[PDB]
Amino acid sequence: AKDFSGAELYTLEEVQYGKFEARMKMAAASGTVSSMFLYQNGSEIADGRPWVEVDIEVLGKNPGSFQSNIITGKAGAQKTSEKHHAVSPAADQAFHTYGLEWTPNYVRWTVDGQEVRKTEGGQVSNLTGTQGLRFNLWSSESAAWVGQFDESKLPLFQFINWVKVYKYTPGQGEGGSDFTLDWTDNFDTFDGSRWGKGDWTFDGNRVDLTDKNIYSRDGMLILALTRKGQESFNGQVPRDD
Amino acid sequence: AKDFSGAELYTLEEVQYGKFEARMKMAAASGTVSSMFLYQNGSEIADGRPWVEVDIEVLGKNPGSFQSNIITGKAGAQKTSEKHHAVSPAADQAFHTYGLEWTPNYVRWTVDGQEVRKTEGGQVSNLTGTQGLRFNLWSSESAAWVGQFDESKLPLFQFINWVKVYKYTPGQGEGGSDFTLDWTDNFDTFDGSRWGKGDWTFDGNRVDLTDKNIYSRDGMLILALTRKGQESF
Numbered sequence: 451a452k453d454f455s456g457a458e459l460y461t462l463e464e465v466q467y468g469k470f471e472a473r474m475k476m477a478a479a480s481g482t483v484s485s486m487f488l489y490q491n492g493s494e495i496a497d498g499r500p501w502v503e504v505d506i507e508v509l510g511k512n513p514g515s516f517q518s519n520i521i522t523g524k525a526g527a528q529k530t531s532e533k534h535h536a537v538s539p540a541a542d543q544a545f546h547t548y549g550l551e552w553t554p555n556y557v558r559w560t561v562d563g564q565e566v567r568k569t570e571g572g573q574v575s576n577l578t579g580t581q582g583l584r585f586n587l588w589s590s591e592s593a594a595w596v597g598q599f600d601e602s603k604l605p606l607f608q609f610i611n612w613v614k615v616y617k618y619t620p621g622q623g624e625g626g627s628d629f630t631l632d633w634t635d636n637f638d639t640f641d642g643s644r645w646g647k648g649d650w651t652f653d654g655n656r657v658d659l660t661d662k663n664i665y666s667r668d669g670m671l672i673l674a675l676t677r678k679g680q681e682s683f684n685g686q687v688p689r690d691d
Numbered sequence: 692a693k694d695f696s697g698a699e700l701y702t703l704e705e706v707q708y709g710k711f712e713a714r715m716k717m718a719a720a721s722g723t724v725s726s727m728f729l730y731q732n733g734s735e736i737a738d739g740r741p742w743v744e745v746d747i748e749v750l751g752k753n754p755g756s757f758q759s760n761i762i763t764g765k766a767g768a769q770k771t772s773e774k775h776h777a778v779s780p781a782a783d784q785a786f787h788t789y790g791l792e793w794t795p796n797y798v799r800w801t802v803d804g805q806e807v808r809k810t811e812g813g814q815v816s817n818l819t820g821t822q823g824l825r826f827n828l829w830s831s832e833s834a835a836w837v838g839q840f841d842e843s844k845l846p847l848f849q850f851i852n853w854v855k856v857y858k859y860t861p862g863q864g865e866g867g868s869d870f871t872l873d874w875t876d877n878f879d880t881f882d883g884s885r886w887g888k889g890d891w892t893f894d895g896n897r898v899d900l901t902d903k904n905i906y907s908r909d910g911m912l913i914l915a916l917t918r919k920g921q922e923s924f
C-alpha cells in the first residue's frame with residue numbers, strides 16, 4: 451500500500467542466548483535503515499507483554515557509524531539505550547563483520563572482532579525468553595533520526611556474505627570465551643528451512659517489506675530497497691576480498 | 692484513602708543517559724515535596740532488583756533550597772547521598788531552570804546553568820539500566836525531613852513551563868557539550884503519547900496521586916496538591 455519496497459530476512463526459529471555474526475556491507479542513503487538485530491517476535495503486540503530486542507542500525511544519513519540499542523519495557527512504553535559507534539571504512543563502502551553476543555549477564559557488540567559496546571545488567575536482565583536473528587532494509591518517516599528520504603539514490607542494496615550463529619557455552623569457547631560455533635550460512639542459496647522473507651510493514655516505516663526483494667547471487671544474500679513495483683537486481687555483487 | 696490529593700507526571704519511555712531540563716516554579720509549604728527526578732520504574736519492587744534514581748526535591752520547610760540525591764542499593768536497603776543546595780530566589784517565588792545530566796561517569800545537577808553538585812563514580816557506577824523523567828507533588832509523614840504539614844497553605848501548585856530532553860552524544864554534542872537536544876514540550880497541551888499521570892501512593896506519602904491534579908493551562912503543565920475533593924482552580 452506504501453510507495454516503496456524494502457526487505458527483511460529472519461530465522462524461522464528463535465533462541466535463548468548466543469553469539470551472532472554477519473559479514474556484510476550496508477546500504478545507506480538519507481532516510482534509510484540498514485540493520486541486523488535480535489528480535490523476540492510478538493514484542494509489537496500491545497497486550498502488556500514485554501519487548502525484547504537488540505539492535506545494530508546504520509542510519510542512512512550517517513554511514514560512518516552505526517547505532518546500537520537494546521529495547522526492553524513494552525509497546526507504548528519502551529526503554530531504550532541508543533548509542534553511536536564509528537566504523538571505518540563507512541558501512542556502505544566496505545564489508546565488516548558485525549557481532550552480537552547475548553547472555554543472561556551481558557550483551558556485547560563487535561565490529562571485525564573488536565568490541566565497540568558491552569552492556570551489563572540493567573536492560574540485559576529483562577531480555578527474557580527467545581529472540582530470532584533478523585536483518586531488514588527500509589526507510590523511516592522520522593527525518594530527525596535518519597534524515598529526509600532521498601528517493602533518487604534508489605535502488606539500494608545490502609549484501610550479506612555469510613552468517614554464523616553460536617551457542618552460549620560460558621567459559622568453554624576458544625581461549626575461555628563464552629561461545630561455540632553452531633551453524634554457518636555462506637548464502638550460496640536461500641535456505642527456506644532456516645530463513646523466512648518478510649512481507650509486512652509497521653507504523654513509521656515508509657516502505658512495504660517484500661519477499662520480492664530478497665535473493666542470493668554470487669554467494670551472497672541481498673536485501674533490496676526499491677520503488678514500489680521496481681524490484682530487481684541487474685547490477686553486480688561487490689567482492690569481499 | 693488519604694485525605695489529600697497529589698500529582699505525578701512521568702514519561703512513558705525510559706532511556707540510558709542524557710540531559711534533562713525543566714523550566715519550573717516549585718510548590719512549597721512545610722511538610723511538602725515538590726520535585727524533578729530520574730526514575731527506573733520497578734525500583735520499588737523488593738524482589739532483589741536494584742534501585743535506580745536521581746532526585747531534586749524541594750522540601751517545603753525550606754523553599755530557599757532543594758535536596759539532591761542518588762538512590763542505589765535496593766528496596767528495604769537503600770544507599771543514599773542526600774545533600775542540600777541553596778536556591779535564590781526561593782524555588783516557590785520564581786522560575787528556575789533545573790538540569791540533570793546523567794552519563795556513565797557522573798551525574799550533574801544545575802540551577803540556571805550553574806552547577807550545584809557533581810558526583811563522579813560511586814553511586815553513579817550503580818545507576819544501571821534506564822530511567823524515565825518524572826515530577827511529583829506530595830507530602831511526607833516524616834516531620835524531621837519536611838516539617839509538620841501546614842495544611843492552611845493548600846491548595847499548592849507546581850508549574851512547569853517547558854521540558855527539554857537531550858540524548859547523550861559524547862564528542863558529537865551541541866554547544867560544546869556531550870548532549871544533543873532530542874525533544875521539547877512547551878506544554879501548550881498535554882501529550883498523552885509522551886506523558887503519563889500518576890494514580891497511586893506509597894508509604895510515607897500522606898497523599899494520593901491522581902490525574903485530577905495534573906493539567907495544562909496557558910502553555911504550562913500544572914501539578915496541584917489539594918485536600919481530597921477540592922482539585923481545581
Ligand SMILES: OC[C@H]1O[C@@H](O[C@H]2[C@H](O)[C@@H](O)[C@H](O[C@@H]3[C@@H](O)[C@H](O)O[C@H](CO)[C@H]3O)O[C@@H]2CO)[C@H](O)[C@@H](O)[C@@H]1O
Nearest residue numbers: 458483485487491492494503505507521586650651652
Ligand atoms: O507490524 C506487524 C509485523 O510486525 C513484525 O515485527 C516488527 C515490529 O512491528 C517493528 O516494531 C520492529 O521494528 C524494529 C524497531 O523496534 C527497532 O528500533 O529497529 C529495528 C531495525 O530497523 C526495527 O526492525 O520490526 C519488527 C520486524 O520487522 C512481526 O515480526 C510480524 O510478524 C508482524 O506481522
Ligand SMILES: OC[C@H]1O[C@@H](O[C@H]2[C@H](O)[C@@H](O)[C@H](O[C@@H]3[C@@H](O)[C@H](O)O[C@H](CO)[C@H]3O)O[C@@H]2CO)[C@H](O)[C@@H](O)[C@@H]1O
Nearest residue numbers: 699724726728732733735746748762827889891892893
Ligand atoms: O507504590 C506503587 C507505585 O510505585 C511507583 O513508584 C514510586 C515509588 O513507590 C516511591 O517509593 C518513589 O518515591 C520517590 C522517592 O524514592 C524519592 O526520594 O523522591 C521521589 C520524589 O519526591 C519519590 O517519588 O516514587 C515512585 C514514583 O511515584 C511506581 O512508579 C508505580 O508504577 C507503582 O504503582
Ligand SMILES: [Ca+2]
Nearest residue numbers: 611612636669
Ligand atoms: Ca558467501
Ligand SMILES: [Ca+2]
Nearest residue numbers: 852877910911
Ligand atoms: Ca510553556
